[model samples]
Target: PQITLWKRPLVTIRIGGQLKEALLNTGADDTVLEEMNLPGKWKPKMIGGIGGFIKVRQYDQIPVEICGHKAIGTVLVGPTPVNIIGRNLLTQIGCTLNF
Candidate 1:
């Protein structure tokens, strides 16, 4: 399946057995979720954006399903304004830009 780019390329995805909407951000290097209770070992890391840097918990091997494609990798959980699907998960789903 092909996804067209929008100002905010939003899409539905499943994480930790729950469904949620997320923005597909090519600008982001990693996926960031607004909030979620996921069980795993997490390391504290700082992420920088337009508003500057903030701390986040980096959980490893989190399962994510995007457009019916399954992928497991790092997911940052914290006080993000919105759930963003970055290259980590997007690449797994073969996400691309199309005019």
Candidate 2:
């Protein structure tokens, strides 16, 4: 038999008035959304970060829907190929990473 490490759902987040799909991952430290996959309506602004910066742009205070939970806050949009639901989002529910 096989086992699953975590059980969660992929979610839709609203940024720049557009909704995007993302996976919920507690192991990560930041909320990462795929810049290339964003909707055409979202013309995000370029954002710089530490370690130089992520070349991709981002939206602000994006609305998130996860497992019937809703979060409205700022998140980073970048060139990362995979969407991540990390610590920042989990923090809202007072959840901590186990690994």
Candidate 3:
């Protein structure tokens, strides 16, 4: 018999003004938010991404949560296939994964 494997668990967060749903991705190094539907005030700061490109600016420490864990950090607002959980967070929390 054979079976599929699950590399990681699905992580979600409450975002936007409405505290809507957003998924997490450990592959992403920084937080990302939708440009239009983003929550909170306008603030920007420079961030150097791992891809050798500098993100002109992102927000300051904004409140966010993942997998039932709460954290305060700014999220980058832009377009993407999905909301990223990002390694900036996942690495900080304790968790276990299995197939």
Q: In terms of lDDT, which candidate is strongest?
A: 1
Residue-by-residue lDDT tens digits, candidate 2, 1-99: 121456555666555466667766766677777754443234445544556656655545666665446776556667765777777776774554343
Off by over 4 Å in 3: 1-9, 37-57, 95-99
Candidate 1 off by > 4 Å:
none
Instruction: Go through the candidates in order and give the C-alpha RMSD of each one to the true structure.
Output: 1.6, 5.7, 5.3
In angstroms, the error of model 1 at 82 is: 1.0
Name the top TM-score candidate. Answer: 1
**Candidate 3: worst 10 consecutive residues by lDDT?**
1-10
Over the full model, what C-alpha lDDT does candidate 1 score relative to the true structure?
0.87
lDDT of 3 at 20: 45
Q: Candidate 1 lDDT, tens digit per residue, 1-99?
A: 666644556788898888999988987899999978888799999998667989899999988998778989999999988999999988888877666
**Order of the predicted models by lDDT, top scorer first:** 1, 2, 3
Task: List model 3 lDDT by residue over 1-99, tens digit each.
Answer: 121235433445665434444554545677665555444465555455556554433655666766456676766765544556666655655433335
Q: What do the candidate models score in CA lDDT, each in turn?
A: 0.87, 0.61, 0.55
Any residue pairs clashing in model 2, and if so which? none
